[PDB]
Amino acid sequence: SKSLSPMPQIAGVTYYGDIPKQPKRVVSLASTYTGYLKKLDMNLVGVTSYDKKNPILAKTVKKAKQVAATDLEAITTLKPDLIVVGSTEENIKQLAEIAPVISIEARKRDYLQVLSDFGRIFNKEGKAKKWLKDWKTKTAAYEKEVKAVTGDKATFTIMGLYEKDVYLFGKDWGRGGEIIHQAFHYDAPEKVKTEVFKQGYLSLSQEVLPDYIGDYVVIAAEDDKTGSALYESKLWQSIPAVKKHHVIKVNANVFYFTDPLSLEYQLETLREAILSSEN
Ligand SMILES: [Cl-]
Ligand code: NA
Ligand code: NA
Ligand SMILES: [Zn+2]
Ligand SMILES: [Zn+2]
Ligand SMILES: [Zn+2]
Ligand SMILES: [Zn+2]
Ligand SMILES: [Zn+2]
């Protein structure tokens, strides 16, 4: 009974059932995509725990219920007309019995393409295009502002802390890499480009961190406690970027994401942080 999406064939996108063109009750089970759906003015009736913990996105989905993919009863009761999932979810068959499902395989389309792809799926091309045009202009302008401070050839490394572990990231695995590397066009150290960029992420022992940091480091964490021991260590304090105050500590609860809402916050935050590194 619903008007249907044209359901274009797009790398990484799989449809289960007849996708509505204008869904009225969307359940997002993939925090990667929730904010894209919000930017295109979808009514989100269910979202993930990560979405509720994203302090930027959460403000826009207060009426949505938090659900997990296993919550077949709760999701059914929300009466969705569309469910959105990542391709690694394991009960897509059961979910597709409740409502049509869009399943997206991460990384097959870039962080901007995902928005225009949803524009095609939902016939919201104008909303997507206007956002993307503004993003292109704004990021080019901000690139000039930040490189006026650092110089054009400064190297950046994207890092994240989780529990006792340290990770490096490339240009397309969140933690600010899309903005730093794709939008501001900052280079990375050679070792990061060689060892990290293709896979997208790399687990590292803390003792080798100096070898992967050049001019600046952006470090994501979910709380202030996680990095405290690292930051106080002689190892960390010996790194030139640390001595120069070129460490930018960011809130992973928003910086994991690449949706438009999260990105807008991240962009202003990173611009201001680079300016502030010379206080
Ligand atoms: Cl932050
Ligand atoms: Na994803
Ligand atoms: Na400053
Ligand atoms: Zn049908
Ligand atoms: Zn059944
Ligand atoms: Zn550039
Ligand atoms: Zn957590
Ligand atoms: Zn400086």
Q: Give DSSP secondary structure letters for 19-44.
A: -BSS-SSEEE--TTTHHHHHHTT--E
Q: What Å resolution does this PDB entry report? A: 1.1
217 touches 157 (CB < 8 A): yes
Distances (CA, A) of 142 to 39, 89, 135, 183, 240: 22, 37, 10, 9, 25
Ion ligand 5: residues, Cβ under 5 Å: 97
C-alpha 57 to ligand 6 mean position (Å): 28
Nearest ligand to the CA of 185 is: 6
User: Which positions ≥6 away from 20 have C-beta within 8 Å?
Assistant: 2, 3, 4, 5, 81, 82, 100
| Strand order across the 82-86 sheet | 13-16, 101-104, 82-86, 26-28, 44-47, 65-66
Give residue 140 CA to ligand 6 midpoint distance, Å: 7
List, in order, residues 6 or more apart from 12 with CB less than 8 Å away. 87, 104, 105, 106, 107, 108, 109
Q: 147 C-alpha vs ligand 8 centroid, how far in Å?
A: 12
Judge whether 13-126 and 142-276 match in fold.
yes
Give the ligand whose atoms come closest to the C-alpha of residue 89: 2
Residues 6+ apart with CB under 8 A from 139: 179, 183, 184, 267
Under 8 Å CB-to-CB from 137, ≥6 apart: which residues?
Answer: none
Burial status of residue 252 (CB atoms within 10 A of its CB: 0-12, 13-18, 19 or more): buried
Residue 225 zone, left/alpha/beta (φ > 0; ψ -120 to 50; rest): alpha
- Cβ–Cβ under 8 Å, residues 255 and 174: yes
Euclidean distance between CA atoms 68 and 30, whole angstroms: 9
Ligand that comes closest to the CA of residue 245: 8
Please determine, looking at this structure, whether the domain spanning 142-276 carries the CATH number 3.40.50.1980.
Answer: yes
**Which CATH number, 3.30.1330.10, 3.40.50.170, 3.40.50.1980, 1.10.357.10, labels domain 13-126?**
3.40.50.1980
H-helix or E-strand containing 93?
A: helix 92-96
- The Cα–Cα gap between 46 and 133 comes to 29
Q: How far is CA 171 from CA 12, 178, 217, 222, 267, in A?
A: 19, 5, 13, 20, 15
Q: Can you say how many angstroms the Cα of residue 23 is from the centroid of all Cα atoms in its chain?
A: 24
CB 157 within 8 A of CB 75: no
Neighbours of ion ligand 6 (CB under 5 A): 185
Contact 237, 243 (CB under 8 A): yes
Neighbours of 271 (CB within 10 A): 20
Q: Where are the domains of the chain?
A: 13-126, 142-276
